Amino acid sequence: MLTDPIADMLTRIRNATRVYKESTDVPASRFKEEILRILAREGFIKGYERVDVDGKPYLRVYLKYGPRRQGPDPRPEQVIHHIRRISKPGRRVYVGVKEIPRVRRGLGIAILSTSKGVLTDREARKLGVGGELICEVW
Amino acid sequence: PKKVLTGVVVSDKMQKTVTVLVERQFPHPLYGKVIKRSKKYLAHDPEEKYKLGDVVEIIESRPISKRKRFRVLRLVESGRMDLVEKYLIRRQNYQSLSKRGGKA
Amino acid sequence: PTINQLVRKGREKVRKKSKVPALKGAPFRRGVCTVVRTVTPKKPNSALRKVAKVRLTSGYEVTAYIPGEGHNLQEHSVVLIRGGRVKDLPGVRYHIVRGVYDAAGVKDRKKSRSKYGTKKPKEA
Amino acid sequence: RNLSALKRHRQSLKRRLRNKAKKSAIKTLSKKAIQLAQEGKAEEALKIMRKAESLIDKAAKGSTLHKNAAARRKSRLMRKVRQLLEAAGAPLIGGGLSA
Amino acid sequence: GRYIGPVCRLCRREGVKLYLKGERCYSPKCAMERRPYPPGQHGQKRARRPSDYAVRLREKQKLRRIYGISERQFRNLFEEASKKKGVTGSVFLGLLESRLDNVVYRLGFAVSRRQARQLVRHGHITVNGRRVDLPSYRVRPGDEIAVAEKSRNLELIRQNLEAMKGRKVGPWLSLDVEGMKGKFLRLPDREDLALPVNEQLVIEFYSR
Amino acid sequence: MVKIRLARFGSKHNPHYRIVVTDARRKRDGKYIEKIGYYDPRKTTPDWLKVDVERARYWLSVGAQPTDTARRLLRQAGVFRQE
RNA sequence: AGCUAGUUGGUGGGGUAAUGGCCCACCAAGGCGACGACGGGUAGCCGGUCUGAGAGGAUGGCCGGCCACAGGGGCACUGAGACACGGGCCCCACUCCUACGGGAGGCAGCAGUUAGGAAUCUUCCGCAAUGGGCGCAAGCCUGACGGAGCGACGCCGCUUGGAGGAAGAAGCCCUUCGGGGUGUAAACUCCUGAACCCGGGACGAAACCCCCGACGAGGGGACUGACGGUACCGGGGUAAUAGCGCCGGCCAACUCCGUGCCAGCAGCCGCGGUAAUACGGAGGGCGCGAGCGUUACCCGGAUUCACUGGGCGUAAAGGGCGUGUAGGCGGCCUGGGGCGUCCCAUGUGAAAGACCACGGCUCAACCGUGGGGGAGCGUGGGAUACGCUCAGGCUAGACG
Ligand SMILES: [Zn+2]
């Protein structure tokens, strides 16, 4: 059994994105899809789709990267340079608006998960709320 | 706001009064996780109404005896010493882990 | 440490280990010397050093060290301990207050006249 | 020396003798009612209880007892007296205790 | 007590030219002429590649000695700055420029904070008439900096305020002679002052 | 006996007071029920005295024998002057 | 590592302003503990202080708030109040007293005294102000206080001068013996005029009270200042204290003589055993300046206790393996509840401090008015993604 999907997902991704994989399915779930809905939306993967491997419902996350490179090492730049499940269980992490951070001087996001749904930080300030600090991409 | 409290009736075997467990959560002051601490209040029960393994309410009150300053505002729900059993056991192991250890 | 180990046990503090049990952490201790012997240093470098085992005004007593060229410390002069050591003379936890009490800095002084306590001259 | 204003000690003392005495009365006299009452002494008990009652509020009229003291003392008493007459009673002088 | 002693010396060692030397620091006499090398016995000998530190030190010194001001202030003032809102580097200079004395000097009632300050400590000057002197005087913007009556009748002063015609007064200044007055138009800024000091390094020396 | 007087806050020759309300039983410069004005002895300003009777009224609507120098000050601002 | 007899609770009662095992009687057989009881150790807690990028560490002097204490211990009377610093009773150590029976004593109040100590002052001034107590009042009382003295103990301002002035004095170090250095440095030229002297010389203070008129409101008028004749205002008024540390690397500033593992330096690794920029003085040099340097202690650097922000194959560091209690952690779906969680309103967060703006003593230190912020908690209200929770379902985990 997983001990915490969210985190797991983020990783499957993390682990996949690092070998320049076309796609990496992640076991389907109400939440997640969400995170991706953003993750994706926010231009951090062409998006994701619902695929049933073994009739078992998953989520194909469609990773993406930059272009090939010069000189020694033609591996494209990573689109998702960073990712970290901040509030894991075993040590929960809630923060209130004025508590939300500035992921990477603002070139990176944070994913709060308020009572107004899951949302980025700039979006948290928007509806001016705070919640449980989830992953943190940039 | 005279304090009120939901908790459990871990023990009655005394006169007119009762023992109450009252779990509690709150963030570790420094390590963030939410620790789930506990405390045994003594509520004053007259008709000896409330019984073992009862969820109930406690209320701040005018003394009745030292180590005894609350009362039973109500019965949240009956039957469920599953919580007691635990309490019971918590202190069960105890006495054993002195120079030899609890048990299981 | 799985948080929990921390919530549960948590980091152990520290503990300073005072190096001058000349007590009360005061900086100077009145005293009366007993022996006014003289020792050799540790392996690295050698030379006869003018120590001064002193009896402190606080039931304690040490191997007071005396600086400056020569000294006027007598087997029974009121001195004054003040810290210091010697990575040469094992077991010498302090220093002397030349100028205070029976001490008056070396008479052949002219420079760092604060230390080695001698006043100031009337040159010209 | 001679802190004159010391006086008070003197005073205190004097004033004491007064206080103590005022009280002792009540005690010694109050029991008189109880004892009587318990026995079944209609009047006298009721009677003397009045004497107490008063002398009590009397007491509590000066920096003796005052406060609620009076009440207590007072109540404490009749309360005591009352139930006590559950032996045939029949409040005579009554007065003290209304019905 | 400040310095008191071979000032042009400071120059030689601090390296550049230091005008704390009223006049003369204008022609074969600022020492810096054919004897710019630093003081000391060796002085005119090689100078080991300055310590990535020495630099912050000196550069600081410089911008300090310039004003011949007390370190306990030249530093205590720095904090007053950093504290304040604004590119510190600026601010400092800004405030380090409203020193009633320097102020005066920039005007022309004298030729050096060294000959100034004194000229300051004898009521010879006045911030808005009711006069002052405490060199350590912060001049807000838009203030009257006239002379001490009893002083108007004074050689130097008169002469200084006299020679004062052809030379200009910095864009945040404005006095005259036909009134021995003046005015603190506004807090200056880096540029405004030519100061041969790199404030940035200064800002730095105070992080160690 | 909740008075209304002055506690010192000035400085060694720069006395500055607040027209407080303590209980006397409390120091001059110790805790208090509420401030309500300041008095400047050396009057080096154009406000060496302010007050707010907006309050003094209720505040005098109960106990508070204001110090003689209290009613004084209060008098200028005349917590009184009921024309 | 297990503690408990007034110990846990009941009934009845005493006691107090008041609840109460606060105390007493009798009855039940309970209370507390690893979420750390009980014991031992150190300790007044706070505001705030220092320090830190902060989270955090360390602290709690002066000022403000609460507490306990008044030779060590116990009890209580008088009173609105105390278990009462300068009130009382007893008891013990102690000083003084004494006709030897028997007594008087409390500075942890201002100041002083002695003692221990590295160390912490004046036996002054004043009732003017502010406050406190009694008083109709006048008015006394006030070592609370407002001041002065004492201490470089800290902090802030300040003088030891200013301009010119030698291709550059003498005396004093270096040497390739040409010469380089201390230096515009001084001497000297005028200029200003600290200290010091002459005159005047307060704010702080307008109320109590007198008069007024209704001892109401409004108006007049008595008088009083310790500091102090000080601060300051005008006059004249003499160029008129510099010291301390450091100069091998970190670390800034190098030379010479002396010097021989000795004399000594030292925070560290280290220097001396004839050329030592490291030991001693000088020449100079750097740093700061009525200060400079040391000594001890707290924070920092020390991500070296690691929440932020560490680790465990060989550097210290995986428990000889298991089963498993408590405890921590939990799959996919829907609904209720809305405790965690977020949100708004309000209440609270004293004052001083610290942030900020203007202001006041010539500046600043210090000071006032104003503004802002402030986690936390209390009452109402709102949200439901997440965590829990309560009820229904599924089958990817588990088991069969
Ligand atoms: Zn020059």
PDB file of all heavy atoms in Angstrom, chain D residues 11-33:
ATOM      1  N   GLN D  11      -5.174  49.656  72.713  1.00  0.00           N
ATOM      2  CA  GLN D  11      -6.496  49.696  72.136  1.00  0.00           C
ATOM      3  C   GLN D  11      -6.927  48.286  71.732  1.00  0.00           C
ATOM      4  O   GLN D  11      -7.867  47.727  72.341  1.00  0.00           O
ATOM      5  CB  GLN D  11      -6.498  50.628  70.928  1.00  0.00           C
ATOM      6  CG  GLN D  11      -6.202  52.061  71.277  1.00  0.00           C
ATOM      7  CD  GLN D  11      -7.000  53.023  70.424  1.00  0.00           C
ATOM      8  OE1 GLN D  11      -8.177  52.785  70.146  1.00  0.00           O
ATOM      9  NE2 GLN D  11      -6.374  54.124  70.017  1.00  0.00           N
ATOM     10  N   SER D  12      -6.212  47.726  70.734  1.00  0.00           N
ATOM     11  CA  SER D  12      -6.475  46.404  70.172  1.00  0.00           C
ATOM     12  C   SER D  12      -6.853  45.516  71.323  1.00  0.00           C
ATOM     13  O   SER D  12      -7.960  44.960  71.358  1.00  0.00           O
ATOM     14  CB  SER D  12      -5.240  45.850  69.472  1.00  0.00           C
ATOM     15  OG  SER D  12      -4.289  45.412  70.418  1.00  0.00           O
ATOM     16  N   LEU D  13      -5.944  45.418  72.290  1.00  0.00           N
ATOM     17  CA  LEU D  13      -6.196  44.602  73.464  1.00  0.00           C
ATOM     18  C   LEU D  13      -7.582  44.903  74.000  1.00  0.00           C
ATOM     19  O   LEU D  13      -8.482  44.053  73.951  1.00  0.00           O
ATOM     20  CB  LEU D  13      -5.146  44.867  74.550  1.00  0.00           C
ATOM     21  CG  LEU D  13      -3.830  44.078  74.452  1.00  0.00           C
ATOM     22  CD1 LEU D  13      -2.857  44.595  75.495  1.00  0.00           C
ATOM     23  CD2 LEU D  13      -4.080  42.580  74.661  1.00  0.00           C
ATOM     24  N   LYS D  14      -7.754  46.127  74.486  1.00  0.00           N
ATOM     25  CA  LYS D  14      -9.034  46.536  75.042  1.00  0.00           C
ATOM     26  C   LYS D  14     -10.157  46.083  74.144  1.00  0.00           C
ATOM     27  O   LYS D  14     -10.974  45.246  74.532  1.00  0.00           O
ATOM     28  CB  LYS D  14      -9.106  48.060  75.226  1.00  0.00           C
ATOM     29  CG  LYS D  14      -8.837  48.544  76.661  1.00  0.00           C
ATOM     30  CD  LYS D  14      -9.785  49.677  77.054  1.00  0.00           C
ATOM     31  CE  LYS D  14      -9.729  50.831  76.049  1.00  0.00           C
ATOM     32  NZ  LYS D  14     -10.764  51.889  76.275  1.00  0.00           N
ATOM     33  N   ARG D  15     -10.173  46.626  72.932  1.00  0.00           N
ATOM     34  CA  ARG D  15     -11.219  46.301  71.969  1.00  0.00           C
ATOM     35  C   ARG D  15     -11.428  44.795  71.887  1.00  0.00           C
ATOM     36  O   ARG D  15     -12.561  44.333  71.705  1.00  0.00           O
ATOM     37  CB  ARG D  15     -10.869  46.902  70.604  1.00  0.00           C
ATOM     38  CG  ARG D  15     -10.430  48.367  70.724  1.00  0.00           C
ATOM     39  CD  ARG D  15     -10.290  49.114  69.387  1.00  0.00           C
ATOM     40  NE  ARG D  15     -11.579  49.501  68.818  1.00  0.00           N
ATOM     41  CZ  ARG D  15     -12.264  48.760  67.960  1.00  0.00           C
ATOM     42  NH1 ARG D  15     -11.779  47.590  67.562  1.00  0.00           N
ATOM     43  NH2 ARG D  15     -13.437  49.185  67.512  1.00  0.00           N
ATOM     44  N   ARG D  16     -10.342  44.033  72.052  1.00  0.00           N
ATOM     45  CA  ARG D  16     -10.435  42.578  72.011  1.00  0.00           C
ATOM     46  C   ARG D  16     -11.410  42.089  73.074  1.00  0.00           C
ATOM     47  O   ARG D  16     -12.501  41.580  72.772  1.00  0.00           O
ATOM     48  CB  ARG D  16      -9.074  41.926  72.256  1.00  0.00           C
ATOM     49  CG  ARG D  16      -9.201  40.515  72.798  1.00  0.00           C
ATOM     50  CD  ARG D  16      -8.463  39.489  71.975  1.00  0.00           C
ATOM     51  NE  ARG D  16      -7.259  39.034  72.657  1.00  0.00           N
ATOM     52  CZ  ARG D  16      -7.250  38.485  73.868  1.00  0.00           C
ATOM     53  NH1 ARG D  16      -8.386  38.322  74.532  1.00  0.00           N
ATOM     54  NH2 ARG D  16      -6.103  38.104  74.420  1.00  0.00           N
ATOM     55  N   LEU D  17     -10.981  42.253  74.321  1.00  0.00           N
ATOM     56  CA  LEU D  17     -11.745  41.850  75.488  1.00  0.00           C
ATOM     57  C   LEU D  17     -13.213  42.029  75.189  1.00  0.00           C
ATOM     58  O   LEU D  17     -14.050  41.201  75.551  1.00  0.00           O
ATOM     59  CB  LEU D  17     -11.339  42.712  76.678  1.00  0.00           C
ATOM     60  CG  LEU D  17      -9.840  43.049  76.676  1.00  0.00           C
ATOM     61  CD1 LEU D  17      -9.476  43.968  77.850  1.00  0.00           C
ATOM     62  CD2 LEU D  17      -9.045  41.758  76.739  1.00  0.00           C
ATOM     63  N   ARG D  18     -13.519  43.117  74.500  1.00  0.00           N
ATOM     64  CA  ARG D  18     -14.892  43.411  74.138  1.00  0.00           C
ATOM     65  C   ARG D  18     -15.397  42.349  73.176  1.00  0.00           C
ATOM     66  O   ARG D  18     -16.358  41.617  73.474  1.00  0.00           O
ATOM     67  CB  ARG D  18     -14.980  44.780  73.457  1.00  0.00           C
ATOM     68  CG  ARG D  18     -16.025  45.699  74.052  1.00  0.00           C
ATOM     69  CD  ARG D  18     -15.661  46.019  75.490  1.00  0.00           C
ATOM     70  NE  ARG D  18     -14.303  46.550  75.586  1.00  0.00           N
ATOM     71  CZ  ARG D  18     -13.668  46.784  76.731  1.00  0.00           C
ATOM     72  NH1 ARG D  18     -14.272  46.532  77.887  1.00  0.00           N
ATOM     73  NH2 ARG D  18     -12.430  47.269  76.723  1.00  0.00           N
ATOM     74  N   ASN D  19     -14.726  42.274  72.025  1.00  0.00           N
ATOM     75  CA  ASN D  19     -15.099  41.346  70.978  1.00  0.00           C
ATOM     76  C   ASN D  19     -15.314  39.950  71.499  1.00  0.00           C
ATOM     77  O   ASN D  19     -16.441  39.423  71.419  1.00  0.00           O
ATOM     78  CB  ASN D  19     -14.057  41.353  69.864  1.00  0.00           C
ATOM     79  CG  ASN D  19     -14.408  42.337  68.758  1.00  0.00           C
ATOM     80  OD1 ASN D  19     -15.529  42.846  68.710  1.00  0.00           O
ATOM     81  ND2 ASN D  19     -13.461  42.596  67.854  1.00  0.00           N
ATOM     82  N   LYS D  20     -14.244  39.358  72.039  1.00  0.00           N
ATOM     83  CA  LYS D  20     -14.315  38.001  72.588  1.00  0.00           C
ATOM     84  C   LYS D  20     -15.625  37.878  73.367  1.00  0.00           C
ATOM     85  O   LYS D  20     -16.558  37.172  72.953  1.00  0.00           O
ATOM     86  CB  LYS D  20     -13.125  37.740  73.508  1.00  0.00           C
ATOM     87  CG  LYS D  20     -13.046  36.314  73.987  1.00  0.00           C
ATOM     88  CD  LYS D  20     -11.831  36.083  74.866  1.00  0.00           C
ATOM     89  CE  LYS D  20     -11.771  34.634  75.341  1.00  0.00           C
ATOM     90  NZ  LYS D  20     -10.576  34.348  76.181  1.00  0.00           N
ATOM     91  N   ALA D  21     -15.692  38.599  74.480  1.00  0.00           N
ATOM     92  CA  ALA D  21     -16.876  38.621  75.333  1.00  0.00           C
ATOM     93  C   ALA D  21     -18.227  38.663  74.583  1.00  0.00           C
ATOM     94  O   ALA D  21     -19.150  37.896  74.890  1.00  0.00           O
ATOM     95  CB  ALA D  21     -16.781  39.809  76.271  1.00  0.00           C
ATOM     96  N   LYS D  22     -18.347  39.582  73.628  1.00  0.00           N
ATOM     97  CA  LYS D  22     -19.575  39.721  72.850  1.00  0.00           C
ATOM     98  C   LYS D  22     -19.992  38.374  72.275  1.00  0.00           C
ATOM     99  O   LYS D  22     -21.164  37.966  72.356  1.00  0.00           O
ATOM    100  CB  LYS D  22     -19.353  40.711  71.700  1.00  0.00           C
ATOM    101  CG  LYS D  22     -19.832  42.135  71.956  1.00  0.00           C
ATOM    102  CD  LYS D  22     -21.352  42.251  71.841  1.00  0.00           C
ATOM    103  CE  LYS D  22     -21.854  43.650  72.256  1.00  0.00           C
ATOM    104  NZ  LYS D  22     -23.361  43.779  72.282  1.00  0.00           N
ATOM    105  N   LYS D  23     -19.000  37.706  71.691  1.00  0.00           N
ATOM    106  CA  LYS D  23     -19.164  36.411  71.046  1.00  0.00           C
ATOM    107  C   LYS D  23     -19.504  35.286  72.012  1.00  0.00           C
ATOM    108  O   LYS D  23     -20.525  34.601  71.850  1.00  0.00           O
ATOM    109  CB  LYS D  23     -17.883  36.057  70.282  1.00  0.00           C
ATOM    110  CG  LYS D  23     -17.920  36.359  68.786  1.00  0.00           C
ATOM    111  CD  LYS D  23     -18.913  35.454  68.061  1.00  0.00           C
ATOM    112  CE  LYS D  23     -18.539  33.980  68.203  1.00  0.00           C
ATOM    113  NZ  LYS D  23     -19.652  33.054  67.821  1.00  0.00           N
ATOM    114  N   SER D  24     -18.628  35.090  72.997  1.00  0.00           N
ATOM    115  CA  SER D  24     -18.808  34.049  73.998  1.00  0.00           C
ATOM    116  C   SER D  24     -20.269  34.017  74.430  1.00  0.00           C
ATOM    117  O   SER D  24     -20.876  32.948  74.562  1.00  0.00           O
ATOM    118  CB  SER D  24     -17.886  34.315  75.189  1.00  0.00           C
ATOM    119  OG  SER D  24     -17.877  35.691  75.517  1.00  0.00           O
ATOM    120  N   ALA D  25     -20.826  35.205  74.635  1.00  0.00           N
ATOM    121  CA  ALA D  25     -22.223  35.355  75.015  1.00  0.00           C
ATOM    122  C   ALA D  25     -23.024  34.441  74.094  1.00  0.00           C
ATOM    123  O   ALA D  25     -23.515  33.373  74.514  1.00  0.00           O
ATOM    124  CB  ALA D  25     -22.659  36.805  74.810  1.00  0.00           C
ATOM    125  N   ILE D  26     -23.122  34.871  72.831  1.00  0.00           N
ATOM    126  CA  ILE D  26     -23.837  34.143  71.782  1.00  0.00           C
ATOM    127  C   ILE D  26     -23.633  32.645  71.853  1.00  0.00           C
ATOM    128  O   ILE D  26     -24.591  31.891  72.025  1.00  0.00           O
ATOM    129  CB  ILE D  26     -23.428  34.633  70.370  1.00  0.00           C
ATOM    130  CG1 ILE D  26     -24.322  35.816  69.959  1.00  0.00           C
ATOM    131  CG2 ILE D  26     -23.524  33.485  69.371  1.00  0.00           C
ATOM    132  CD1 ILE D  26     -24.081  36.349  68.561  1.00  0.00           C
ATOM    133  N   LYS D  27     -22.387  32.208  71.725  1.00  0.00           N
ATOM    134  CA  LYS D  27     -22.128  30.778  71.796  1.00  0.00           C
ATOM    135  C   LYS D  27     -22.914  30.206  72.979  1.00  0.00           C
ATOM    136  O   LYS D  27     -24.003  29.617  72.812  1.00  0.00           O
ATOM    137  CB  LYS D  27     -20.629  30.528  71.972  1.00  0.00           C
ATOM    138  CG  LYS D  27     -20.176  29.141  71.535  1.00  0.00           C
ATOM    139  CD  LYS D  27     -18.688  29.130  71.205  1.00  0.00           C
ATOM    140  CE  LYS D  27     -18.365  30.163  70.117  1.00  0.00           C
ATOM    141  NZ  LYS D  27     -16.953  30.144  69.599  1.00  0.00           N
ATOM    142  N   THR D  28     -22.353  30.429  74.164  1.00  0.00           N
ATOM    143  CA  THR D  28     -22.918  29.979  75.433  1.00  0.00           C
ATOM    144  C   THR D  28     -24.427  30.116  75.503  1.00  0.00           C
ATOM    145  O   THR D  28     -25.134  29.292  76.101  1.00  0.00           O
ATOM    146  CB  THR D  28     -22.311  30.778  76.602  1.00  0.00           C
ATOM    147  OG1 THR D  28     -20.964  30.332  76.833  1.00  0.00           O
ATOM    148  CG2 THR D  28     -23.155  30.611  77.878  1.00  0.00           C
ATOM    149  N   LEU D  29     -24.919  31.166  74.880  1.00  0.00           N
ATOM    150  CA  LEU D  29     -26.327  31.407  74.910  1.00  0.00           C
ATOM    151  C   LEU D  29     -27.068  30.685  73.809  1.00  0.00           C
ATOM    152  O   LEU D  29     -28.193  30.246  73.997  1.00  0.00           O
ATOM    153  CB  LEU D  29     -26.573  32.898  74.803  1.00  0.00           C
ATOM    154  CG  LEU D  29     -28.024  33.262  75.075  1.00  0.00           C
ATOM    155  CD1 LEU D  29     -28.362  32.849  76.508  1.00  0.00           C
ATOM    156  CD2 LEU D  29     -28.244  34.763  74.845  1.00  0.00           C
ATOM    157  N   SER D  30     -26.434  30.562  72.655  1.00  0.00           N
ATOM    158  CA  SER D  30     -27.069  29.925  71.518  1.00  0.00           C
ATOM    159  C   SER D  30     -27.332  28.463  71.813  1.00  0.00           C
ATOM    160  O   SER D  30     -28.434  27.957  71.616  1.00  0.00           O
ATOM    161  CB  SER D  30     -26.176  30.062  70.288  1.00  0.00           C
ATOM    162  OG  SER D  30     -25.812  31.413  70.053  1.00  0.00           O
ATOM    163  N   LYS D  31     -26.305  27.780  72.284  1.00  0.00           N
ATOM    164  CA  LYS D  31     -26.445  26.375  72.610  1.00  0.00           C
ATOM    165  C   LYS D  31     -27.672  26.215  73.478  1.00  0.00           C
ATOM    166  O   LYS D  31     -28.394  25.225  73.384  1.00  0.00           O
ATOM    167  CB  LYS D  31     -25.230  25.908  73.383  1.00  0.00           C
ATOM    168  CG  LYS D  31     -24.979  26.756  74.615  1.00  0.00           C
ATOM    169  CD  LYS D  31     -23.691  26.336  75.308  1.00  0.00           C
ATOM    170  CE  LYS D  31     -22.483  26.386  74.364  1.00  0.00           C
ATOM    171  NZ  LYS D  31     -21.229  25.958  75.048  1.00  0.00           N
ATOM    172  N   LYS D  32     -27.887  27.208  74.337  1.00  0.00           N
ATOM    173  CA  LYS D  32     -29.028  27.198  75.244  1.00  0.00           C
ATOM    174  C   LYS D  32     -30.274  26.883  74.446  1.00  0.00           C
ATOM    175  O   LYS D  32     -31.102  26.098  74.888  1.00  0.00           O
ATOM    176  CB  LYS D  32     -29.191  28.556  75.952  1.00  0.00           C
ATOM    177  CG  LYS D  32     -30.310  28.591  77.013  1.00  0.00           C
ATOM    178  CD  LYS D  32     -30.244  29.846  77.917  1.00  0.00           C
ATOM    179  CE  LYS D  32     -31.125  29.709  79.182  1.00  0.00           C
ATOM    180  NZ  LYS D  32     -30.961  30.826  80.169  1.00  0.00           N
ATOM    181  N   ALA D  33     -30.400  27.480  73.267  1.00  0.00           N
ATOM    182  CA  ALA D  33     -31.564  27.237  72.435  1.00  0.00           C
ATOM    183  C   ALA D  33     -31.540  25.816  71.898  1.00  0.00           C
ATOM    184  O   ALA D  33     -32.484  25.046  72.094  1.00  0.00           O
ATOM    185  CB  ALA D  33     -31.604  28.230  71.292  1.00  0.00           C
TER     186      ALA D  33
END
